[PDB]
Paper text:
Meprins (Meprin α and β) are multidomain, Zn-dependent proteases. They belong to the astacin family and metzincin superfamily of endo-proteinases. Originally discovered in the early 1980s in human intestine and mouse kidney, Meprins have only been described in vertebrate tissue such as human skin, leukocytes and various cancer cells. They are involved in a broad range of proteolytic processes, among these connective tissue homeostasis and immunological and intestinal barrier function. Meprin β shows a striking preference for negatively charged amino acids proximal to the scissile bond.
To investigate this interaction in detail, we crystallized the catalytically active ectodomain of human Meprin β in complex with the tertiary-amine inhibitor MWT-S-270. The mature Meprin β variant Meprin β62–595 (MβΔC) crystallized in the presence of MWT-S-270 in two different space groups, the already reported hexagonal space group P6122 (178) (data not shown) and, additionally, under the conditions reported here, in the monoclinic space group C2 (5), with two monomers in the asymmetric unit. Each monomer spans the catalytic active protease domain (Asn62-Leu259), the MAM-domain (Ser260-Cys427) and the TRAF-domain (Pro428-Gln595). Both monomers are covalently linked through an intermolecular disulfide bridge connecting residue Cys305 of monomer A and B. This feature could not be observed in the crystal structure described previously. Each monomer comprises at least three bound metal ions: two tentative calcium ions and a catalytic zinc ion. The hydroxamic acid moiety is bound to the zinc ion in a bidentate fashion, which is commonly observed with these inhibitors. One benzyl residue is directed to the S1-site, while the second benzyl residue of the tertiary amine is directed towards the S1′-subsite, shaped by Arg238. The unexpected interaction is a fixation of the benzoic acid moiety within the S1′-site via a network of hydrogen bonds, i.e., the sidechain OH of Ser212 at a distance of 2.8–2.9 Å, the backbone NH of Ser212 at a distance of 3.2 Å and a water-bridged hydrogen bond with Thr214 at a distance of 2.6 and 2.8 Å. The closest distance between the carboxylic acid and the guanidinium moiety of Arg184 is around 4 Å, albeit the electron density for the C11, C12 and C13 of MWT-S-270 in monomer A and C8, C9 and C13 in monomer B is not defined, and the moiety of the inhibitor is probably highly flexible via rotation around the single bond connecting C7-C8. Moreover, the whole loop forming the lower rim of the active site cleft, harboring Arg184, is also less well resolved, as reflected by higher B-factors, especially in monomer B. The missing electron density of the side chain of Arg184 in monomer B and the barely resolved Arg184 in monomer A (together with the less well resolved whole loop) led us to conclude a high degree of flexibility.
Numbering used by the authors:
A (entry chain B), B (entry chain A): 62 to 594
Amino acid sequence: NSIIGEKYRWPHTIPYVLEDSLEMNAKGVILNAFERYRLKTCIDFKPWAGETNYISVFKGSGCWSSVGNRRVGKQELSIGANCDRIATVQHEFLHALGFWHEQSRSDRDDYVRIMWDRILSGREHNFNTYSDDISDSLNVPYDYTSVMHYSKTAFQNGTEPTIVTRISDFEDVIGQRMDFSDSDLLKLNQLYNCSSSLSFMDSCSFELENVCGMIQSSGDNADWQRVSQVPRGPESDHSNMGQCQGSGFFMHFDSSSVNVGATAVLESRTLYPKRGFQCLQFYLYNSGSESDQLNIYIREYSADNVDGNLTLVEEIKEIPTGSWQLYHVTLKVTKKFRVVFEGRKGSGASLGGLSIDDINLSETRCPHHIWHIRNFTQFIGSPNGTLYSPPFYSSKGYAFQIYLNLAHVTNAGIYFHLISGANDDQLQWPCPWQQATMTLLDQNPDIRQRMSNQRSITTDPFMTTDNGNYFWDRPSKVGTVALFSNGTQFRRGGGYGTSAFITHERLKSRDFIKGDDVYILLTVEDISHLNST
Amino acid sequence: NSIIGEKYRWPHTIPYVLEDSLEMNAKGVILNAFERYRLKTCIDFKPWAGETNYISVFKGSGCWSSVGNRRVGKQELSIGANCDRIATVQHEFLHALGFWHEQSRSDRDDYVRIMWDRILSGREHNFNTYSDDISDSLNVPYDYTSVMHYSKTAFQNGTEPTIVTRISDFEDVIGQRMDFSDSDLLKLNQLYNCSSSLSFMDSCSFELENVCGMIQSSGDNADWQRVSQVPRGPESDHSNMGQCQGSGFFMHFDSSSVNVGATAVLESRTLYPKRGFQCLQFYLYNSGSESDQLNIYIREYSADNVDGNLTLVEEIKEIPTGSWQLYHVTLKVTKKFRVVFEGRKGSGASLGGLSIDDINLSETRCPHHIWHIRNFTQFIGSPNGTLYSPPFYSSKGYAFQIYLNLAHVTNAGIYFHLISGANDDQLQWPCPWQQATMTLLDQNPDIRQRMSNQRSITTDPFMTTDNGNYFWDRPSKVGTVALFSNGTQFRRGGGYGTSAFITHERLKSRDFIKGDDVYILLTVEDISHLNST
Ligand SMILES: *[C@@H]1O[C@H](CO)[C@@H](O[C@@H]2O[C@H](CO)[C@@H](O[C@@H]3O[C@H](CO[C@H]4O[C@H](CO[C@H]5O[C@H](CO)[C@@H](O)[C@H](O)[C@@H]5O[C@H]5O[C@H](CO)[C@@H](O)[C@H](O)[C@@H]5O)[C@@H](O)[C@H](O[C@H]5O[C@H](CO)[C@@H](O)[C@H](O)[C@@H]5O)[C@@H]4O)[C@@H](O)[C@H](O[C@H]4O[C@H](CO)[C@@H](O)[C@H](O)[C@@H]4O[C@H]4O[C@H](CO)[C@@H](O)[C@H](O)[C@@H]4O)[C@@H]3O)[C@H](O)[C@H]2NC(C)=O)[C@H](O)[C@H]1NC(C)=O
Ligand SMILES: *[C@@H]1O[C@H](CO)[C@@H](O[C@@H]2O[C@H](CO)[C@@H](O[C@@H]3O[C@H](CO[C@H]4O[C@H](CO[C@H]5O[C@H](CO)[C@@H](O)[C@H](O)[C@@H]5O[C@H]5O[C@H](CO)[C@@H](O)[C@H](O)[C@@H]5O)[C@@H](O)[C@H](O[C@H]5O[C@H](CO)[C@@H](O)[C@H](O)[C@@H]5O)[C@@H]4O)[C@@H](O)[C@H](O[C@H]4O[C@H](CO)[C@@H](O)[C@H](O)[C@@H]4O)[C@@H]3O)[C@H](O)[C@H]2NC(C)=O)[C@H](O)[C@H]1NC(C)=O
Ligand SMILES: *[C@@H]1O[C@H](CO)[C@@H](O[C@@H]2O[C@H](CO)[C@@H](O)[C@H](O)[C@H]2NC(C)=O)[C@H](O)[C@H]1NC(C)=O
Ligand SMILES: *[C@@H]1O[C@H](CO)[C@@H](O[C@@H]2O[C@H](CO)[C@@H](O)[C@H](O)[C@H]2NC(C)=O)[C@H](O)[C@H]1NC(C)=O
Ligand SMILES: O=C(CN(Cc1cccc(C(=O)O)c1)Cc1cccc(C(=O)O)c1)NO
Ligand SMILES: O=C(CN(Cc1cccc(C(=O)O)c1)Cc1cccc(C(=O)O)c1)NO
Ligand SMILES: *[C@@H]1O[C@H](CO)[C@@H](O)[C@H](O)[C@H]1NC(C)=O
Ligand SMILES: *[C@@H]1O[C@H](CO)[C@@H](O)[C@H](O)[C@H]1NC(C)=O
Ligand SMILES: *[C@@H]1O[C@H](CO)[C@@H](O)[C@H](O)[C@H]1NC(C)=O
Ligand SMILES: *[C@@H]1O[C@H](CO)[C@@H](O)[C@H](O)[C@H]1NC(C)=O
Ligand SMILES: *[C@@H]1O[C@H](CO)[C@@H](O)[C@H](O)[C@H]1NC(C)=O
Ligand SMILES: [Ca+2]
Ligand SMILES: [Ca+2]
Ligand SMILES: [Ca+2]
Ligand SMILES: [Ca+2]
Ligand SMILES: [Cl-]
Ligand SMILES: [Cl-]
Ligand SMILES: [Zn+2]
Ligand SMILES: [Zn+2]
């Protein structure tokens, strides 16, 4: 579904302009989409600085883009109303990069049947097919899960689908708008001879005996052990969760059989950063004591320190026992370096130890907060599936809470709530231009194969409610009464998001649910600086 | 371990000359090595035709090459005596393409320990390291399995190893000379922006519900079913063989519940050939009748029949029941086409069906013959581990037999025997310049991830034995008496190969043994046309 012709290729770095017609939330979402390209492709984006051909993103009618580099100078790409979704931006830029819709493939009739009699009159022009002399599928099979594939209802007249998948099980699969599919990357990365990405650094699941090049320190008291189980926990690794026999390993620091203060250090291979900011993430399991801790250091190398200088970046203490726990550690390294995992036994009694698995490192921004939902499957489609996150404080001081609604039969909804907080007396009301990004984590061991489902909203301080109040005003003024889990009363403002965050079927696909656990990643950022672009 | 500098890159297609000093067997092995590059990389090779810089392969002392395009015009690469091994040629050309040995990495001391007290005087320079200002490891961890990594005995004085891997399990792993490692390809394909290969077409294991783009035909009597088990067999697929719970699927044609002559047709996606010759391979399981057959067709597309005209290429009949069977089908397609699998029920009664799994298609030469060894593990290191293949006939008419000796404690040996045959009266004796290629198949589901162990020998008609006879003379004249399994007597000539075909440890690694089955692939080709190159 790629356009044939070297004249349609962009440079690997695309110049762009974010026109002022774009909504605030749209501008932030667009910049997020660029981050995804930087993680999984060799395509990059930079502000236009006089280049002849560039992309002008503006709030036109609908979401659309030309296919390929048209070399017309200013090439328009429309992110109109309701197009402010990261998957939609990725989709539109795949058009710009030279891709038609998946159902436009020359072989599309072998996999889907277009119901022309059920298309709305005047809408049949979007269901075209391109022959193999102008369209090249790059030796990749037809991809129902493509982010460039319409859903079954596209431009439908009535309740009857316009696109019918011959493999009936794919009827509701087509139309996913979560992230690149594996084939989307295969085709794009092939079309642009992509050898590496900007933001990806390392992914380690310990499934090979060389443990991703990590080295055991000799100036310590114990070694991390590559094991597939620990008696007291965990019974299996996090990557496979015991699915495959003889597979599924993790590194374990046995704190039960060492003295207080003893340490085991595991250091990563040498890494060369390109951006100056990184996010280190990994899953931890604690079957020992709450006094045991994991310390993260950064060993930076320079001409001044050829041996490398250590810097403590985070101490992870009081680790919950009995379940895998996701952690994020923010880094700001600019020189070649290693990551250091030091497991230290505390004074408390331990009968197990610390386990680490599914490590990923990328030159990306960490999420500000994480919502970890245990025993999640019971709530899908259940009346008691009305879930509220713990209270969090945004970077600017606003207290907020997340509402995830799984009670309805087909769709899951997610909403961002402001709640009463300790800084409300000194905060700006109504909440102005705070972009809340909510991401349902696709818990694939490899960050490169994650199709996380992400939606963003921006608080508009002029939005009002039916009774005349400002929607994002101080929760004590406009919010309803709510009770914390501990019984403490608080005020919860209006919730804003979408009732169509993710379908229950997609929620049960891939690795959104893993170990009956779900993780929702949260970032609340002031984007008022995007008003002028 | 890659050399830094854009001037050290070759063109993707390297011009080469095979000097007349090269041994006959070496010339054939080199051309075989090129086929591996064409299968797994974007590197190609063409005979030198006046290009300024080209590679001149000649029979120097030992096996060596410069690192990278040195832009000195004629750049020599030595394949001397005993260097005529496909993995050694691949290794030497990885040098030419710009790679140092893996243990020369700047971080090599974190993974291996050099026992300097054990190096031969004057050979310690061979263990030097290149810093990261001239060497780039391309963000790939240290690779013990690299084809560019010395074995533990390199330049050793005595019986004690010079290179000790700090992860002890890799002590005997380093030094593998079977094929590219996965990391070797990751680095090379990254260094030359390889987006695709010349010879790879498709790999299908049916592990995704879209079944690699294969189509179910409507003009037949039944459908192939994507299943993970069949009551009468097989109990699991061939890819995973029940290793992973809920995973491992194959396509099944149920002959038990259809009439005589009924067919189920599965057609592949559209394919575009580049070379004019292809090899289709796949694994079959038969739990039905001995009269059931699998027919392979090719649907070629042309201006004459836009719908496509079918051509029968092979009829697979009398399929042994109760075990997975590997098949190879030779193709000669030059226009865009599909592969067509037609399962046909015979007249016999059936309680099962035909199963197909782990299909691979590449623009490569099929092996002429295959030796399938059942219940293989019992013979490893056993006194009764002296195995003889069935008799085969080479393309020129010579009858031959393969001898695999597993009785030695550490090494497996393989030998090529000429045997008495029905054309011996009219054959040229002594056997002149017939190259026998013996390949222990690494039965990975994906052909692209196979590290098959291959050795080749060429019959020298002047080679003599101690008693004055020609080694490769007519077996009736110079051979010993032997009995086929059915009791029929024949004459077996001398066996030539190596007692160090593969170590037992490597033999038990990866997928050489799969389902307790081993496949040895055989090609005997006249290479007398290579005397003048
Ligand atoms: C115990 O087990 C033992 C081991 O299995 C077993 O021994 C085997 O017994 C069987 C049965 O008796 C023997 O089978 C015979 O094999 C012969 C050899 O076949 C191979 O070689 C053929 C000839 O190749 C030459 O010609 C080709 C082109 O024609 C060239 O491409 C070659 O380069 C080669 O040229 C060279 O040789 C020429 C001299 O012949 C010379 O002029 C020329 O210049 C050059 O030097 C190939 O055609 C043949 O390929 C076919 O068969 C194989 C099967 O293995 C397939 O895989 C191939 O795809 C292809 O189909 C082999 O490579 C055969 O000639 C002989 O065939 C004849 O008979 C059968 C059965 O009736 C017919 O199907 C066939 O058409 C032939 O019929 C012709 O001849 C007969 C008279 O001979 C005649 O009646 C008929 O009308 C017609 O004229 C037969 O298959 C086998 O050889 C034995 N193996 C060994 C190792 O010895 C033993 O019996 C068992 N014991 C018991 C008790 O059961
Ligand atoms: C039942 O459950 C409920 C639900 O949890 C419980 O309710 C909680 O109870 C606890 C304890 O009583 C409360 O803790 C208190 O929290 C407040 C707020 O913390 C957050 O904000 C801090 C201030 O942020 C402002 O300032 C920073 C710079 O200082 C700035 O960067 C920010 O952007 C923000 O700026 C804005 O606000 C300013 C006014 O404050 C303006 O001037 C400015 O212009 C801006 O408008 C912040 O410091 C803090 O960050 C730290 O802590 C978090 C979490 O611990 C951590 O993640 C960070 O890394 C930091 O380490 C938070 O973001 C806090 O101010 C209180 O601390 C003060 O008081 C104590 C006691 O004297 C001192 O020790 C401190 O030093 C400090 O002086 C206190 O921690 C919590 O707020 C409350 N939650 C809710 C939702 O109600 C309830 O208690 C439970 N009931 C029972 C019975 O158990
Ligand atoms: C990906 O790499 C290929 C191979 O180098 C590039 O193809 C070349 O493009 C130039 C510019 O038009 C042509 O003159 C050459 O003939 C092409 N070579 C081949 C073998 O086709 C291609 O341009 C690269 N893609 C991008 C997006 O840069
Ligand atoms: C692989 O592609 C890269 C582009 O990403 C090529 O690197 C460029 O090479 C040209 C010419 O040598 C230089 O002018 C550029 O500065 C390079 N750009 C970058 C980003 O490195 C490289 O030449 C290609 N390699 C091969 C073997 O074709
Ligand atoms: O693919 C697109 C959007 N698509 C139409 C569409 C709209 C809603 C749902 C679906 C679906 O998949 O269910 C598809 C085509 C298009 C082309 C030009 C203009 C507009 C417009 O928005 O007016 C829309 N954009 O690139
Ligand atoms: O790398 C190699 C092989 N050679 C380097 C070499 C080349 C030419 C001459 C000599 C020499 O001094 O005679 C040595 C090192 C080697 C040889 C044998 C076994 C192993 C091993 O891996 O054990 C390593 N060529 O590119
Ligand atoms: C949609 O279908 C209805 C029912 O056939 C018809 O009345 C109407 O005109 C159609 N509208 C369009 C835009 O196709
Ligand atoms: C929620 O409801 C589901 C379905 O009715 C039930 O299985 C589950 O136990 C309930 N959860 C809690 C925490 O009560
Ligand atoms: C090898 O070691 C032996 C044992 O000490 C020594 O006598 C000999 O000189 C050494 N040879 C070389 C070439 O290092
Ligand atoms: C060969 O010997 C091994 C062990 O010595 C034994 O397990 C196997 O069954 C034997 N195979 C035979 C006798 O065919
Ligand atoms: C030697 O090689 C040339 C070149 O291919 C070939 O034509 C010739 O026949 C070969 N010699 C013999 C005896 O086959
Ligand atoms: Ca793991
Ligand atoms: Ca240690
Ligand atoms: Ca399979
Ligand atoms: Ca059918
Ligand atoms: Cl992530
Ligand atoms: Cl193969
Ligand atoms: Zn589109
Ligand atoms: Zn070498």
